[PDB]
Amino acid sequence: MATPSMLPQWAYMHIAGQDASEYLSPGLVQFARATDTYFSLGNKFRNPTV
Amino acid sequence: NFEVDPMDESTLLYVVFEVFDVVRVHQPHRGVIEAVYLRTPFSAGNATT
């Protein structure tokens, strides 16, 4: 899944569906919060708004 | 269909069509970087180099 466009890719390019606090592994979420104030990961993952 | 005031000068009309431009950069391995690109109403990308 990379070469297709259309119907599957809406989900996987994050214009709909899961947040970036739900699409990441639950240890990378922890890392992001704890190292928030020293090295932000804020602009590195996009949160869909629908 | 637009209606504009006359102007002596030749002019352009810049119509921006607001879409989604989204790139998703994946690095599977070191020294390897890839991207999948998507634009939806005007189709584009999908690792088009």
Partner: peptide, 7 residues
């Protein structure tokens, strides 16, 4: 209109 994020 306009997509951007803060996480």
């Amino acid at each position: 209109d306009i997509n951007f994020s803060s996480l």
